[PDB]
Scaffold this active site. Structure first.
Site, PDB file in Angstrom:
ATOM      1  N   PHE C  79      46.605  36.066  41.619  1.00  0.00           N
ATOM      2  CA  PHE C  79      46.451  35.779  43.045  1.00  0.00           C
ATOM      3  C   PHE C  79      47.694  35.009  43.477  1.00  0.00           C
ATOM      4  O   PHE C  79      47.759  33.785  43.369  1.00  0.00           O
ATOM      5  CB  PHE C  79      45.174  34.996  43.312  1.00  0.00           C
ATOM      6  CG  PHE C  79      43.920  35.785  43.082  1.00  0.00           C
ATOM      7  CD1 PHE C  79      43.476  36.693  44.024  1.00  0.00           C
ATOM      8  CD2 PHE C  79      43.183  35.615  41.926  1.00  0.00           C
ATOM      9  CE1 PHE C  79      42.325  37.419  43.815  1.00  0.00           C
ATOM     10  CE2 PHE C  79      42.032  36.337  41.713  1.00  0.00           C
ATOM     11  CZ  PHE C  79      41.602  37.240  42.659  1.00  0.00           C
ATOM     12  N   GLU C  86      43.601  35.031  37.218  1.00  0.00           N
ATOM     13  CA  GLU C  86      42.348  35.194  36.497  1.00  0.00           C
ATOM     14  C   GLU C  86      42.582  36.063  35.270  1.00  0.00           C
ATOM     15  O   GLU C  86      43.210  37.122  35.366  1.00  0.00           O
ATOM     16  CB  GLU C  86      41.288  35.827  37.398  1.00  0.00           C
ATOM     17  CG  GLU C  86      39.956  36.097  36.713  1.00  0.00           C
ATOM     18  CD  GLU C  86      39.060  37.021  37.515  1.00  0.00           C
ATOM     19  OE1 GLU C  86      39.586  37.827  38.310  1.00  0.00           O
ATOM     20  OE2 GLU C  86      37.825  36.943  37.346  1.00  0.00           O
ATOM     21  N   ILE C  87      42.079  35.616  34.123  1.00  0.00           N
ATOM     22  CA  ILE C  87      42.104  36.398  32.892  1.00  0.00           C
ATOM     23  C   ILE C  87      40.731  37.033  32.723  1.00  0.00           C
ATOM     24  O   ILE C  87      39.721  36.328  32.614  1.00  0.00           O
ATOM     25  CB  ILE C  87      42.472  35.531  31.679  1.00  0.00           C
ATOM     26  CG1 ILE C  87      43.979  35.282  31.656  1.00  0.00           C
ATOM     27  CG2 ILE C  87      42.017  36.202  30.391  1.00  0.00           C
ATOM     28  CD1 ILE C  87      44.426  34.326  30.577  1.00  0.00           C
ATOM     29  N   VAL C  88      40.691  38.363  32.693  1.00  0.00           N
ATOM     30  CA  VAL C  88      39.426  39.085  32.720  1.00  0.00           C
ATOM     31  C   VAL C  88      39.031  39.652  31.360  1.00  0.00           C
ATOM     32  O   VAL C  88      37.838  39.906  31.135  1.00  0.00           O
ATOM     33  CB  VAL C  88      39.471  40.212  33.773  1.00  0.00           C
ATOM     34  CG1 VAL C  88      40.542  41.226  33.428  1.00  0.00           C
ATOM     35  CG2 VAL C  88      38.117  40.882  33.893  1.00  0.00           C
ATOM     36  N   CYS C  90      40.300  39.828  26.859  1.00  0.00           N
ATOM     37  CA  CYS C  90      41.181  39.412  25.779  1.00  0.00           C
ATOM     38  C   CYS C  90      40.544  39.816  24.461  1.00  0.00           C
ATOM     39  O   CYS C  90      39.343  39.618  24.266  1.00  0.00           O
ATOM     40  CB  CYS C  90      41.428  37.900  25.806  1.00  0.00           C
ATOM     41  SG  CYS C  90      42.105  37.238  24.268  1.00  0.00           S
ATOM     42  N   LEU C 123      42.503  30.584  35.213  1.00  0.00           N
ATOM     43  CA  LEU C 123      41.056  30.421  35.215  1.00  0.00           C
ATOM     44  C   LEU C 123      40.424  31.604  34.499  1.00  0.00           C
ATOM     45  O   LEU C 123      40.788  32.754  34.760  1.00  0.00           O
ATOM     46  CB  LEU C 123      40.513  30.313  36.641  1.00  0.00           C
ATOM     47  CG  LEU C 123      40.867  29.034  37.401  1.00  0.00           C
ATOM     48  CD1 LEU C 123      40.373  29.113  38.833  1.00  0.00           C
ATOM     49  CD2 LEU C 123      40.286  27.814  36.711  1.00  0.00           C
ATOM     50  N   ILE C 154      37.319  34.601  42.314  1.00  0.00           N
ATOM     51  CA  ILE C 154      37.046  35.035  40.949  1.00  0.00           C
ATOM     52  C   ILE C 154      35.612  35.543  40.873  1.00  0.00           C
ATOM     53  O   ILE C 154      34.810  35.311  41.785  1.00  0.00           O
ATOM     54  CB  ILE C 154      37.301  33.904  39.933  1.00  0.00           C
ATOM     55  CG1 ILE C 154      36.243  32.805  40.050  1.00  0.00           C
ATOM     56  CG2 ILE C 154      38.686  33.317  40.137  1.00  0.00           C
ATOM     57  CD1 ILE C 154      36.398  31.704  39.026  1.00  0.00           C
ATOM     58  N   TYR C 157      30.511  35.737  35.442  1.00  0.00           N
ATOM     59  CA  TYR C 157      30.137  36.520  34.267  1.00  0.00           C
ATOM     60  C   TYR C 157      29.012  35.786  33.552  1.00  0.00           C
ATOM     61  O   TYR C 157      29.235  34.716  32.979  1.00  0.00           O
ATOM     62  CB  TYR C 157      31.329  36.727  33.335  1.00  0.00           C
ATOM     63  CG  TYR C 157      32.301  37.781  33.808  1.00  0.00           C
ATOM     64  CD1 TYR C 157      31.909  39.103  33.951  1.00  0.00           C
ATOM     65  CD2 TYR C 157      33.615  37.454  34.105  1.00  0.00           C
ATOM     66  CE1 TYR C 157      32.797  40.068  34.380  1.00  0.00           C
ATOM     67  CE2 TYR C 157      34.510  38.411  34.534  1.00  0.00           C
ATOM     68  CZ  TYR C 157      34.097  39.716  34.670  1.00  0.00           C
ATOM     69  OH  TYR C 157      34.987  40.671  35.098  1.00  0.00           O
TER      70      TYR C 157
END
Lengths: 346, 464, 352, 87
Positions: C79, C86-88, C90, C123, C154, C157
C-alpha cells in the site's frame, strides 16, 4: 570493503546496475498499476461501520438492469420521435363558460350571472359613446370606447423621452382646410384601407379575429411553451441519433463475443478431463480446438480493434463528452430536415 | 534453553559469576578455575588452587560509560549479542536480555542514535580508542550509585505500578464496513465477483519441473501450449471484472439510499421513462447521462403543460389565476361525484431557465442544455387596476399604467382622451396652448395638466 | 556464511520477482508458488489461494533453482500511499527446509522493498507455528500503528495472530552479518583498551605470609578502580523476569501451539455477547493472565494454576457441558495436567 | 371640400433606411401581428424595443411620425386602390 548502504535509484539506468541496486537479480517490467480501478481514497475507515447492511442479492438485482445485453427491443425506444402535430395548435376562446357546462348535468342554470358590462360576451371590441358624454363620474366606468383597430393602432406607438410635425401642414393654406365628421365604424375601415395601401396588412382576396381573444394572458404562455417544446424535440432527436450510431457497433461486438466465449468454454473443459483421468498424448480434439480459437481471434477480432468498444468514457479525462457541439450541430440540422420532410408529407 | 549463551558457575561455591566481578587463578595447575570475589575474599580454595603463592587475575565487569552516558559496556555488548541471537530488530527480547528495565522504546532509540542515526558510520564513536574523555569525566562510583538508585526506583515503581489492562479482542479489520453485504472499500474489491467460479479451472494446474521448450523442436510442447491457452481466458475474465467495476464506480451506483429515495419521489411516467433509458449508461459519463435524462423529463413536462393550457383555453378561462382556481374547483367536484413540473410551468411567473432558446440561432446548442414620475396630485387616491375590472389593460404600456393608477382613470377613457388630444394637436401642426389641453380633457385642471405634461414629455405633442 | 549464501554466490540458486503480467516464465513461477502454498496451508480453500497468488496487484519473490524449479517464496501487496505492506503468504518446501533459506529470503524481500519504494511497516497474520521464525526475523506481537492506518485495508484471517515489524532505515539487511560483526569487533577492542584483566597481579598481600583471612574487595587498588560495590554485586544476580520465566514460557508456547487451546486465544467480545460479563465476575483469558504474569502479580505457581482452573470453570459456566465448548475446556485441562505431570515440581498440586 | 392626402413616401423610406433591411422583416412581422390582434403590449415591446433602440433617437421618432401620418390621413382623400408602386 563492501558498501554498507542502499544506493538510491535514478531514471533511465542500465539493467545491470538496476540489479546491483536490487540484489534480487530480476524484477517485473510492467508495474501493471495502470489496471488499478484507482488508488484507495486514503481515508479514515475506523469510524463505526453501519449495523444494517443490504443483502447482496438485492444489490445484484438492483444493478442487473444496467448491464443487460442490447436487443432490437431497446433499439426501437430511440428511433422514435413521438407526436409532433397536436401540441402546436392554437385554439380560440370557447363559447360556453365552464360553469355553464358544469351546470349542464342538473337544474343549475336557473341563475344567470351575465356581466352587466359584458353583454353579448364581448365587453370589449364594441365602440360606444363619444367625448360628448365624457364626465368625471363616468371616467371611472368603461362606458366609452373607440373600437378595436383604432385602439391597437394608437397603442402601437411607443413613448420616448415633435412627433406630430407633418411636412406641408405649416402653411396657412392647410390651416384653412376643413374636415368631415366620421364615426368609429368608419374610422376603423379607413385605417384598414390605409394599412392595406402601405403594405402592413394583406391585400384583399383576388376577385380580424378580435372576438377570439388571441392576445389573452394564457395565449402568450402557450406560445412560449410551444417554442420551448419545438426547441427541445430537435435536441432529443440528435442525441438519440448518436446513441443509435454507437449501439450498432456495440451489438456487433456482442455477437462476436457470444461465439468467442463458447470456444473458450470448450477449450477450457476439454483439458479438465486430462487432469481428471490423469491421462499420454494430447487428443486430436484438444489439438484442433486451439487452432480454431486462434484463427477466429486473430482474423475476425481485427475488425473490433478500436479501443472504445469496451470502455466507458471518464469525466476526469476532460472533454470526453460524446455530445460535442461540432457534431451536435450537424445532427440537429439533419433532424430538422427530416422533420420538414415529414411535415411536407403530412 | 533457547538462549545460545554460556552460563559460568564458580568452582567452589557453585554460584553464577558471569555478570559479576570475579578472580581467576592464573597458575597452569588450575584450568578454567574461576573464584568469585566472596570466594577469593573469604579465600575458600578447592582442587589445586593455592591462594598462598599463586598469582591471580581480576575479571572486571566493565561498568563505565563508553558511548552513551546512561549505558555501560556490558549493556552495549548484551545489545549486540541479542542482535546476533534475537536478530537486529526484535526489540522486546533484546531489551529483556540487556536488563536495567529499559523498555523497548528506550533500547530502540538508543541503538538508533548510537549506531543507525548518528554523526557516525560503521566505525563507532568519534575517531579512535585514544579518546578517553568520557570515562574520566565521571568516576565509576558515581555511575554505580546512579545505576543503583535508578534500579531501586524502577523496581519500587513496578511493585507499586498499576496492573496492565487486559488485552481487548484484536481489532479485526472487517473490510466490510461499507453499507453493502460483501464490499471492501479499502481494497475496491467485492467478495463475490462477476465470475467468481473462473478459478475452478485453474486451481489444480501443475507444471512439469524444468520444462517450457522442446529439447528437439524448439517450440512449446503440446501439453505446455494447451496449459498456457487456458490462462489467457482467465486473464480475460479478470479484465472483464475490472471493466464492470470501472463502470460501477462511475454514476455512483453504490448509493442505494439516495438513488432509491430519488426514484420514489418521482411520479409514474417519469419513473417508467427512466427505467426505459437506464441501459445506455455504459457508453456515457455522468454528466452526459444526467443531461440525457433531464432532457427526456423536460420534454415530457412541456408536453403535459401545453396540453393543460390547451384544455384551459377552450373553457373561456382568461387568466392563470382563474385557471388554478378552476382546477381546484374541478378537483373538488370530481371528489363530489410539492408541485410537479407541469404545475410549475403554468405558474403566473415562469422559471428563469425557460426565458432563452435552448439552441441559439446559428444551430449550436447552448452549453447549459439541461422614467417620468408625475407628482401625486393633491387629494388623489390611486385605485388598483385588476384584469377583471380593466378590460383593455393588456395593451397599455408600463410607462402609462402608472399614470392611469395615479390619476384614477380607467383604460378606455384614457385611450379616448389620447385620441382626441392627438387629433387636436395634429390638426394644428402639433402645437397647442395649455388652456387648450385643459379644455380638451374636460376634467379637473390638475388631471388635464398632468396628462398634458406626460404627453409633451413623451414627445407626441409640443407646447406652444 | 550459511549454505544458502554460498549456493547463491556459486549460482546454485537465484531469486526472481514476478507478477502476473502474462509471460511464460512468470506463469510457471506463480504456479509453482501456488502449489507450494496450497501444500503448506491445507485448511484454506484452494480457490482462495489461486485467486490471491494470480492477482494483478500482489507481487511475489521466489527462489528458483537452475533447472527452473521453485523452492519457496513470499507474496505481499504494498500500500504505497499508506506507508506499509501486507504479507499474505510465506512458505518453503519441507524437503528443502533444512538448508535454512528462510532468513536469506526474508532479508532479500526486505532489502528489495526498501530499495524499490518508501514503505516502512510490515503487517501480517502469522501462522501458529511460524511465530518463532517471525520473531527471530525482527517482528513483534505488539502493534504500534494507529487504528486508522490498517483498518478496512488489510484482511482478517481466522486462526491467525497479527504482528508488526518496523524496518530500520538505511541499512543493508543482506550484509547484516559483516556490518554487525565489525561493530562488535570495534566495541570489543574499545573494551579491551581499558580492561585490566590482562594484568597478572600477585597474591593478596594479606595472604603472602600463608594466612588466609577475609579481605575487603574495595581495599585492593585494582578492584577499587574497577568500581566494584556490594550492592551491584548482589543486584547482578537477580534476573529481570521471575526465576521460573523460562519454564513458564516453554509451557505457554506449548499450550499456544496446541490446537486444543484455540478458543481461549482471544477474549470474548462484549458486543457479540452481553451475558458473558454478567454471568462471569472474573472473566479470564490467556492474554490477561500473560499480561498479569508480565506484571509479576502472580507471586506463586498456585496463582497460575488457579487462573487456568478459573478459565476452565468460566468456559464451562458460560457454555453448556453438552456443547463442544466445555468438552474442549476439559480436554485442555487434561492437556495442561499432562504438561504439569511432566514437570515433577508441579505434579503434587493436583487435587484428589 | 375634403382636403388632399399627405405624402407618405418619405416617411416610410426614411423608416426603411433607418431600421435596416436586415432586421426589418422581424419588425414588420411583429407590427402586423400586433395590429391583427395576436399579441399584447408586453410581447410587442419585448420584440421591438431592441430594434428601435438608439442614442441619437431617430428611430422611435420615425416610428411615431409614421403612426401619426397614418392616423391623420383618416380625414383626407381615399388613395388609389392597390399596393403603392413606390414599395
Amino acid at each position: 570493503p563492501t558498501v554498507y548502504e542502499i544506493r538510491p535509484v535514478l531514471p533511465g539506468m542500465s539493467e545491470e546496475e538496476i540489479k546491483e541496486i536490487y540484489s534480487v537479480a530480476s524484477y517485473p517490467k510492467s508495474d501493471l498499476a495502470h489496471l488499478t480501478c484507482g488508488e484507495p481514497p486514503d481515508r479514515d475507515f475506523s469510524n463505526s461501520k453501519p449495523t444494517n447492511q443490504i443483502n447482496f442479492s438485492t444489490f445484484s438485482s438492483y444493478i442487473e438492469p444496467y448491464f443487460r445485453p442490447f436487443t432490437e427491443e431497446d433499439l426501437a425506444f430511440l428511433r422514435e420521435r413521438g407526436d409532433r402535430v397536436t401540441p402546436f395548435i392554437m385554439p380560440k376562446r370557447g363559447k360556453k363558460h365552464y360553469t355553464e357546462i358544469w351546470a349542464e348535468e342538473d337544474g343549475a342554470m336557473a341563475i344567470d350571472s351575465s356581466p352587466p358590462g359584458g353583454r353579448d360576451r364581448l365587453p370589449p371590441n364594441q365602440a360606444r359613446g363619444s367625448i360628448d358624454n365624457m364626465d368625471d363620474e363616468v371616467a371611472e366606468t368603461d362606458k366609452l370606447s373607440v373600437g378595436p383597430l383604432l385602439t391597437r393602432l394608437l397603442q402601437a406607438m411607443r413613448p420616448e423621452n415633435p412627433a406630430t410635425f407633418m411636412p406641408e401642414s405649416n402653411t396657412e393654406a392647410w390651416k384653412k382646410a376643413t374636415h368631415p365628421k366620421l364615426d368609429y365604424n368608419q374610422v376603423d375601415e379607413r385605417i384598414k384601407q390605409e394599412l392595406r395601401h402601405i403594405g402592413f396588412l394583406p391585400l384583399p382576396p383576388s376577385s380580424a379575429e378580435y372576438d377570439g381573444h388571441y392576445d389573452d394572458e394564457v395565449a402568450a404562455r402557450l406560445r412560449v411553451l410551444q417554442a420551448r417544446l419545438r426547441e427541445q424535440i430537435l435536441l432529443n432527436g440528435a442525441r438519440k441519433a448518436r446513441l443509435t450510431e454507437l449501439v450498432k457497433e456495440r451489438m456487433a461486438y456482442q455477437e462476436y463475443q457470444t461465439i468467442l466465449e463458447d470456444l473458450d468454454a470448450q477449450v477450457n473443459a476439454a483439458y479438465l478431463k486430462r487432469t481428471r483421468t490423469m491421462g499420454p498424448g494430447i487428443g486430436d480434439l484438444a489439438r484442433t480446438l486451439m487452432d480454431r480459437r486462434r484463427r477466429w481471434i486473430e482474423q475476425i477480432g481485427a475488425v473490433f480493434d478500436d479501443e472504445g468498444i469496451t470502455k466507458c468514457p471518464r469525466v476526469e479525462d476532460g472533454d470526453t463528452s460524446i455530445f460535442g457541439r461540432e457534431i451536435m450541430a450537424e445532427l440537429i440540422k439533419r433532424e430538422k430536415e427530416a422533420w420538414d420532410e415529414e411535415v411536407e408529407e403530412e | 534453553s533457547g538462549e545460545g549463551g554460556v552460563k559460568y558457575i564458580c568452582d567452589v561455591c557453585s554460584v553464577d559469576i558471569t555478570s559479576t566481578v570475579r578472580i581467576r587463578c592464573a597458575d597452569p595447575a588450575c584450568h578454567d578455575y574461576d573464584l568469585c570475589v566472596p570466594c577469593f575474599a573469604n579465600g575458600s580454595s578447592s582442587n589445586a588452587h593455592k591462594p598462598a603463592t599463586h598469582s591471580f587475575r581480576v575479571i572486571e565487569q566493565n561498568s563505565f560509560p563508553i558511548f552513551d552516558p546512561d549505558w555501560g559496556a556490558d549493556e552495549e555488548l548484551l545489545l549486540l549479542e541479542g542482535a546476533e541471537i534475537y536478530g537486529l530488530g526484535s526489540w522486546a527480547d533484546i531489551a529483556d536480555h540487556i536488563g536495567g528495565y529499559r523498555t523497548k522504546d528506550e533500547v530502540r532509540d538508543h541503538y538508533l542514535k548510537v549506531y543507525i542515526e548518528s554523526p557516525n558510520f560503521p566505525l563507532p564513536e568519534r575517531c579512535s580508542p585514544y579518546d578517553l574523555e568520557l570515562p574520566n569525566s565521571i568516576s565509576r562510583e558515581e555511575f554505580q550509585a546512579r545505576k543503583k538508585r535508578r534500579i531501586e526506583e524502577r523496581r519500587e515503581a513496578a511493585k507499586n505500578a498499576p496492573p496492565p489492562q487486559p488485552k481487548t479482542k484484536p481489532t479485526a479489520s472487517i473490510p466490510a464496513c461499507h453499507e453493502i453485504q460483501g464490499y471492501m472499500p479499502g481494497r475496491l474489491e467485492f467478495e463475490t465477483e462477476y465470475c467468481n467460479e473462473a478459478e475452478e479451472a485453474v486451481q489444480l494446474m501443475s507444471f512439469d519441473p524444468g520444462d517450457g521448450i522442446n529439447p528437439r523442436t524448439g517450440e512449446l510442447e503440446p501439453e505446455m501450449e494447451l496449459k498456457l491457452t487456458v490462462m489467457e481466458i482467465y486473464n480475460n475474465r479478470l479484465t472483464q471484472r475490472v471493466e464492470r467495476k470501472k463502470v460501477i464506480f462511475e454514476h455512483n451506483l453504490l448509493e442505494y439510499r439516495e438513488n432509491t429515495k430519488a426514484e420514489k419521489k418521482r411520479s409514474r411516467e417519469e419513473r417508467e421513462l427512466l427505467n426505459k433509458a437506464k441501459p445506455f449508461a455504459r457508453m456515457m459519463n455522468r454528466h452526459d447521462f444526467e443531461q440525457f435524462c433531464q432532457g427526456l423529463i423536460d420534454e415530457l413536462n412541456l408536453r403535459q403543460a401545453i396540453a393543460q393550457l390547451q384544455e384551459w383555453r377552450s373553457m373561456r378561462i382568461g387568466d392563470l389565476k382563474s385557471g388554478e382556481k378552476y382546477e381546484q374547483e374541478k378537483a373538488l367536484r370530481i371528489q363530489k361525484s410539492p408541485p410537479s413540473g407541469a404545475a410549475l410551468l403554468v405558474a403566473p411567473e415562469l422559471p428563469a431557465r425557460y426565458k432563452e432558446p435552448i439552441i441559439d440561432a446559428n444551430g449550436f446548442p447552448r452549453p447549459d442544455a439541461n422614467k417620468y414620475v408625475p407628482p401625486p396630485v393633491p387629494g388623489v387616491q390611486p385605485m388598483n387596476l385588476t384584469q377583471d375590472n380593466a378590460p383593455d389593460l393588456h395593451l397599455l404600456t408600463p410607462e402609462e399604467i402608472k399614470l392611469c393608477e395615479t390619476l384614477r382613470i380607467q383604460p378606455k377613457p384614457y385611450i379616448m382622451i389620447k385620441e382626441q388630444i392627438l387629433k387636436e394637436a395634429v390638426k394644428g401642426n402639433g402645437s397647442l396652448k395649455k388652456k387648450q389641453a385643459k379644455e380638451i380633457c374636460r376634467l379637473d385642471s390638475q388631471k388635464g395638466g398632468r396628462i398634458f405634461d406626460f404627453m409633451v414629455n413623451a414627445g407626441w405633442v409640443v407646447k406652444a | 556464511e550459511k549454505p544458502a549464501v554460498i549456493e547463491e554466490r556459486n549460482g546454485e540458486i537465484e531469486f526472481r520477482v514476478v507478477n502476473n503480467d502474462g509471460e511464460r516464465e512468470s506463469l510457471i513461477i506463480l504456479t509453482g508458488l501456488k502449489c507450494i502454498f496450497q501444500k503448506q496451508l491445507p485448511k484454506m480453500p484452494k480457490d482462495y489461494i489461486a485467486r490471491l497468488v494470480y492477482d494483478r496487484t500482489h507481487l511475489s519473490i521466489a527462489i528458483v533453482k537452475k533447472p527452473l524449479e521453485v523452492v519457496g517464496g513470499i507474496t505481499y501487496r504494498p500500500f504505497k500511499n499508506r506507508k506499509f505492506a501486507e504479507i499474505v503468504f510465506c512458505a518453503i518446501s519441507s524437503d528443502q527446509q533444512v538448508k535454512g533459506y528462510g532468513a536469506h529470503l526474508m532479508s532479500h524481500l526486505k532489502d528489495y522493498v526498501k530499495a524499490t519504494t518508501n514503505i516502512e511497516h510490515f503487517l501480517t497474520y502469522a501462522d501458529n507455528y511460524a511465530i518463532g521464525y517471525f520473531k527471530k526475523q525482527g517482528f513483534t506481537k505488539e502493534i504500534t500503528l494507529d487504528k486508522s492506518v490498517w483498518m478496512g485495508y488489510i484482511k482478517d484471517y481466522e486462526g491467525g495472530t497479527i504482528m508488526q515489524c518496523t524496518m530500520i532505515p538505511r541499512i543493508r539487511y543482506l550484509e547484516q552479518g559483516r556490518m554487525l560483526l565489525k561493530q562488535k569487533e570495534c566495541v570489543q577492542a574499545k573494551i579491551r583498551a581499558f580492561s585490566k584483566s590482562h594484568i597478572v597481579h600477585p597474591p593478596p598481600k594479606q595472604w603472602r605470609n600463608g594466612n588466609v583471612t577475609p579481605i575487603d574487595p574495595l581495599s585492593i587498588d585494582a578492584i577499587r578502580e574497577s568500581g566494584w560495590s556490594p550492592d551491584m554485586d548482589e543486584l547482578a544476580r537477580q534476573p529481570r523476569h521471575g526465576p521460573n520465566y523460562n519454564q513458564l514460557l516453554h509451557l505457554l508456547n506449548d499450550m499456544q501451539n496446541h490446537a486444543s487451546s484455540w478458543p481461549f486465544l482471544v477474549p470474548v467480545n462484549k458486543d457479540e455477547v452481553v451475558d458473558y460479563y454478567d454471568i462471569i465476575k472474573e472473566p479470564m483469558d490467556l492474554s490477561t493472565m500473560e499480561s498479569k504474569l508480565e506484571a509479576d502479580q502472580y507471586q506463586t505457581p498456585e496463582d497460575f494454576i488457579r487462573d487456568a482452573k478459573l478459565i476452565f470453570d468460566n468456559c464451562r459456566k458460560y457454555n453448556n457441558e453438552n456443547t463442544p465448548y466445555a468438552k474442549s475446556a476439559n480436554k485442555l485441562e487434561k492437556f495442561m495436567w499432562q504438561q504439569i505431570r511432566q514437570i515433577p515440581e508441579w505434579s503434587h498440586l493436583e487435587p484428589s | 371640400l375634403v382636403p388632399p392626402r399627405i405624402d407618405l413616401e418619405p416617411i416610410y423610406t426614411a423608416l426603411k433606411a433607418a431600421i435596416g433591411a436586415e432586421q426589418w422583416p422581424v419588425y414588420k412581422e411583429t407590427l402586423t401581428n400586433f395590429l391583427i390582434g395576436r399579441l399584447n403590449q408586453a410581447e410587442l415591446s419585448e420584440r421591438i424595443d431592441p430594434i428601435l433602440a438608439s442614442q441619437d433617437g431617430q428611430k422611435e421618432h420615425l416610428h411615431n411620425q409614421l403612426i401619426a401620418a397614418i392616423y391623420a390621413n383618416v380625414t383626407r382623400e381615399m388613395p388609389d386602390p392597390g399596393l403603392a408602386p413606390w414599395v
